[PDB]
Structures are given as C-alpha cells and as structure tokens.
Design a protein around this ligand. Structure first.
Ligand code: ADN
Ligand code: ADN
Ligand code: ADN
Lengths: 257, 257, 257
C-alpha cells in the first residue's frame, strides 16, 4: 500500500551531506513520496534517545506514513533491520536494536519482517552504512507500495528487541530534558497525583505550585505541570530549569503533599 | 483559498521531534501541502528575534503561502492566536504577542481573526503546546482552504500587538547579527547616507570604506555596505566582524563624513 | 528538461531565515519542484568543505536533480555563477570558484554556461547575495525546464575552476572528519592496501585491525575500515576517534604491514 509520507530520524546529524544522501536514495526509489525529517540530532549511538524521540510520532503522523529511523552502531553485523506494520496502518523500518520500542508502545506491531531481500536494498550495500543502504532504501520501497512480505521473512513481535522503561509508583524519574527550553519530563502519569513537595541533587526539596501552563507563575519561577501528553513535568517560566537544577535522565523524582 | 505552501518558524529547535510532530499534524490536515522550515532556532521565548526572522518572508515567498510561526511563552493563557490575510494574499498564523509585527510591516494585515474555533484546532488542545495544537493546526486548515472567517471572530488590525522598531535619524543602531558570518545589520536606510567615520565599545571610531560587496577590500579587512535589502551593514571580508568588534543588538552606530 | 528535485547546499546556516528565503524564491519560480537540503552548515567561506560535501551527491540523487550550491565569498565580483549539465543528466548551479569540483569528478561536465542572463535571476540582484538572486533563482528556472543555453554564454569545461585533490601513493592524508561520530576519512583507495601499522601527532604509531565494520572490535577500540565508498577510514567502535587522536584534514597517514 502506497505510503507517500516518509518521516526520517537518525544520529548522523544535519551538518553534512550524510542524511541528504539517504534522501537522495529514497527520492530515487519513491519519486511520489514526501520526505520530512523528525531529527538527525540524536546523540551518536544513543538508541534510547532515538527511541524516545519516536514515541509520539505514530500519533502525530497520518496512517500513510513510513517511519524510517536508524541509530545503528551494529551496522554490518548480525543485528538485522526490521520492517513493521502497526495498528494504525503505518509502516516502520529500523535496526532491531530497541530503536522502535516506544513508537511500538504507542501503536503495536501487527506484522513484522526482517529486511533480508537484496531487492529492497541499495546495492552494493556498504557494511558501515546499513542506515542508507538498507533502512532508508527499504523504507522508500515500502513507501512506493512494495508488499511488506517481500522484504524478507516474518518474525514474531516478541523477536523485536525492546528497551526497558521505568514506571512510576509518588516516586518516578527524569525521562528526558527538552534541551531547547530546559524543561524536565518525568514518567509520572496524570492519574497518580490527581503546593506540592518535590524531592530530587543532595536531597533537594522544592515546594512547587501545580499549574496548567508556564505563565501561571512569575517569570523565572519554577512550576509543576502536565506536559504535552499526560506526564508530570518541571520548568521555569521563560527560563531554563536544568540550568538552575541540573538533573539528568535517570535521576529520581518524588512528589508528595 | 488553497495555500499549498506552509512556511514554518518556531523556537522549539530542530534537535528533537517537537517541530516534526507539528509537521505531522499539518500533513494530516493538509495532505496537498508542502511544508518548508524558515527556522526553528529562534532563541527560546525571543519574540523579537522571531519577528525579525519573519520580516523578509512575505516578499520572498509566493502568494499561496501560509506563514506559520510560533514563539509562544504565553501558551495556555489569555493571549490568543491570530490568523491574518495580508495585502499580498498570503495567510499568517501566530500568537498575538508581536511575533508577526515586521512581516506585517512588509505586507499589511487586510483581515484578521482570533483563532477560537475548536474545529481548526488539534483536539484535545494541550495548554503548554498551543504552537502545535492551535498555530500549526490552524495554519494547515487554512492551507487546505478553510475560510479565514471560520477560525473565530474578526478583530481590528490595531488589536494586533506590535513590537516597537527604532528608526535612524546619522545615528542608528544594531538590529541583528548574521551569526553564520558575524555581519552586523543596522537600521540605517540607503537614503540617509547617500571613507566614512563609524562610531560604536568605549567610543570606538573606525574609518571604513563604503563598498558594494565583501571582496572590494582585502581579506580580513572591515567594510561598510548596503545589505540584502537597503540597510547599512558592517562586515569583514571572509572573516567575522563581531569577533573583532563584539557589538550586540541595541548598540548605537553613528556614521559621519 | 524539467528537473523536479532541487538539492540545496550553502554556508549560510539553518539557524536563521536566509536559507529559507532562497527556498521561497525557488518555490516561486518552480512550484512543481521539491526542495531538499544537502546542508547549510558548510563552514563560512569554506569552498573546499562544500566541494567535499557535494562529491557523492550526483551518485545518490536521481537524474532529474538540480544541484544548487553556493559558498560564495566572491559574491558581487567578476567571479561568475555557472550552470552545468553532467553525464548523468543532472544540472548543477554554483559559483565558478571550485565548489562543484568533486561533484564534477563523479559525473563530468558535458555542457557548461555562465549565468549572465537577467531573465534567470531574481531582480534586482543584490551584490552581497548572489547565492539567492543568481544561484538559487537560476537553479529554479532550470528545474522548471528553462533551456540551459538561455542562462548565458557557453564556456569550455576547462574554464571551470577546480580544487586540487591529493592522491595516495602507502602514504596518504586525512581528507575529512565525520564530525557527528569523529570518524576519519583518508584518500587511500581500496586497491592500494589490498593487523596493520598506521603512522600519523609526534609520529604516532598504531597497530590497528582492518575490519569490515565498527562492531568487529570491542567498544571504544580503534579500527581501520573501508568507508561508504572505497576509501580507508579510522574510527573507534561507538566512540569518537578525533577525541583520542586529534587529526585535522591535511595530516599525513601512512599504512604499512
Ligand atoms: N564509530 C562508529 N561506531 C559505531 N557505529 C557508528 C560509528 N560511526 C557511525 N556509526 C553508525 O553507523 C550508522 C549508519 O549505518 C549510524 O546510525 C551510526 O550509529
Ligand atoms: N519553560 C517555558 N516557559 C515559557 N514558555 C515555554 C517554556 N517552554 C516552552 N515554552 C513555549 O511553548 C511554546 C509552544 O506552545 C514555545 O513556542 C515556547 O516558547
Ligand atoms: N563577511 C563576508 N565575507 C565574504 N563573504 C561573505 C561574507 N558574508 C557572507 N558572505 C558570502 O555571501 C554568500 C551569499 O551570496 C555566502 O555564500 C557567503 O560565503
């Protein structure tokens, strides 16, 4: 089934031609397709960061999307590329190394195949650039309407490598930092908490108001809020939270009355 | 009226998925549309910088463009999003916080509405991301051909918040720095000045040649020139001016014989 | 001949609107065209870096591509813009300052013209922005199907300025660094070498395994490999090579048994 929108993520950066050569390959295979970057600024080899960036992609993108993603330090080894159709009807192509984990949490795999057929690859395949020659190439063939079954053998969904994700029990942790603004996102869902005391940084205790948005406190002041989808977040109104309280992903966050 | 080209600016950066999720929403609503970034590297919350970046957009882009822009620290408050048709026939969508000021100077507002209708929003609207759920969503509905009147109530052009812009009287000031090259742009127009003495930095006095272009002086040497549209500028031939004379926006520049 | 794909490179960065204004001009002229960035992060004025980034573009992109590239410190002087049809049938537009050198090595010029006709320029042409008003504008006219002969007078291929490129004789040198990962690329071709001793950094001698890919050594360990097209490269498995051995382009690399 034609999937005319390719959404593209990698760790190769956008500061040289690498990411663009992949687009060249994709436009060659699927001249009817639109290519849009998710980002190419995933930290090098950081599969978990890439996985986090993909989490909300299935929901925000239409059904005719191919999610093409690679953070692939295992390029040229036995770790295969996989192609997946999800419950929304979107297609996903990436290394079977955990990268697609959180995107699949959002919309589960319905059918999954290993990408082994030379006919969906850019030949000759260079061992160090499976990202271009297998992931990007296959994504474009699928965008063009190639049968998922033609990419290679079917595998069971459990054969898709998944990254563990910690759940809040209220004790949670920092999942990621929105580096543009310095806002801190936790794994604490809306329902578990429904001024509060927040414990982090030599047992830092902050008394923070729970707000709907940034502007409900004065400029530079800290706030708690529920972020763009259902998770507790910390920020400063028009300032950078991690410049005041330098927390990293994995650090514990406890919220109590 | 269909406006098949969406030009997109924000302060969310291009180093994670945020800006891409907005594009996902827009492609979902307007599958016939082309989306092109202006930039997402506006300094966080810096409405004036965003406004400056938009100034030359109306002239450079065709009439069938929707200018979709958000630098929106007031997200989730009483400061509304507005939708505008300009004199060129382009559409603009952004927060009513001054962001569109200089784009509107270039091509004035003809009709303006507040974006209040849920039917042009991405539901449910998250208080902290009006950028995606109102600005981007509405821009896409307009691109798809939604009547401007359908977005919400008409307002008078004077209800559009405008950022003050200093005029040269020759005494002017630094407006912006082209950070890629370090060239300094002033507010001094072509007609007011038509070697010269330039006073800035402990009363720095420079004797500079007025040139048409960079290569009219030797490499590394300073020059005065009229920039890409009618304003006096300072640069070094194949070097970075603000690395030699570290001026910031707002600093006074006086030019005399 | 219509060339519906414009691949776009410059040194103006993607952190402000400059690169986007060029796209505005191009979309205005060629509304049927798709514009994809190669990169805008070429170091300022660095023609050689830009040239290197373009080298693999002809091969990776389809025949209906216009390669639009400018790193143009000679803007507004006697150094003209040129338009070229290559052996693949692609079109290229850029300053005649060496920028297109390595792209032309990959697919030689068949026909070349100087861009002198006002009718393929964005009028009025600003002396400091030939990149937008001549290079981008002309690229779009060619994309739209303008006869190459209409841009200006024919020149001989030898009138295209070329950058010298050092050949390996095994003694070679560092050509470029993949800054995303810190991998080092040399000019040493596959055939000249077909554990090895590598001499660089106070006569640094390393004993390195020759591998097909990164994962064939333990994490953090150095390796030799043949890169994404036929040249000897140095890297660390999931680490940054130039953070351990800080080599720059031009530095000698000797490989021996
Ligand atoms: N030095 C390296 N070590 C391990 N993987 C690398 C290295 N350089 C690039 N890669 C990987 O190559 C992949 C592309 O095939 C990238 O996604 C990247 O993770
Ligand atoms: N910590 C913050 N304080 C104020 N505004 C913010 C913050 N983080 C993000 N935003 C704003 O949210 C907007 C998107 O709705 C962005 O344009 C940005 O300016
Ligand atoms: N200060 C400068 N000196 C020389 N060239 C410049 C300068 N600033 C911008 N340019 C050149 O202008 C070109 C666009 O016409 C860019 O490719 C850039 O190389």
């Amino acid at each position: 089934m034609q999937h005319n929108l390719i959404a593209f993520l990698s760790d190769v950066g956008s500061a040289d031609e690498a990411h663009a050569l992949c687009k060249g390959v994709m436009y060659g295979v699927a001249p009817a397709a639109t290519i849009v970057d998710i980002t190419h600024d995933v930290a090098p080899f950081d599969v978990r960061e890439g996985a986090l960036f993909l989490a909300d992609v299935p929901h925000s993108f239409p059904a005719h999307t191919v999610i093409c993603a690679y953070v692939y330090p295992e390029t040229g080894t036995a770790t295969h590329t996989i192609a997946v159709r999800n419950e929304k009807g979107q297609l996903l192509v990436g290394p079977n190394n955990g990268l697609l984990s959180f995107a699949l949490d959002a919309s589960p795999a319905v059918e999954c195949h290993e990408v082994l057929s030379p006919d969906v690859m850019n030949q000759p395949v260079t061992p160090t650039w499976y990202g271009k020659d297998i992931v990007a190439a296959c994504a474009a063939h699928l965008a063009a309407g190639t049968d998922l079954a033609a990419v290679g053998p079917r595998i069971d969904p459990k054969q898709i490598v998944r990254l563990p994700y910690a759940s809040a029990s209220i004790r949670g942790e920092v999942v990621r930092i929105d580096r543009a603004f310095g806002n801190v996102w936790t794994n604490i869902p809306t329902h578990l908490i429904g001024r509060l005391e927040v414990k982090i940084l030599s047992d830092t205790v902050l008394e923070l108001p729970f707000c709907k948005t940034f502007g409900e406190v004065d400029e530079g002041q800290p706030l708690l809020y529920l972020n763009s989808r259902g998770r507790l977040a910390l920020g400063l109104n028009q300032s950078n939270f991690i410049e005041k309280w330098p927390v990293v992903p994995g650090d514990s966050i406890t919220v109590s009355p």
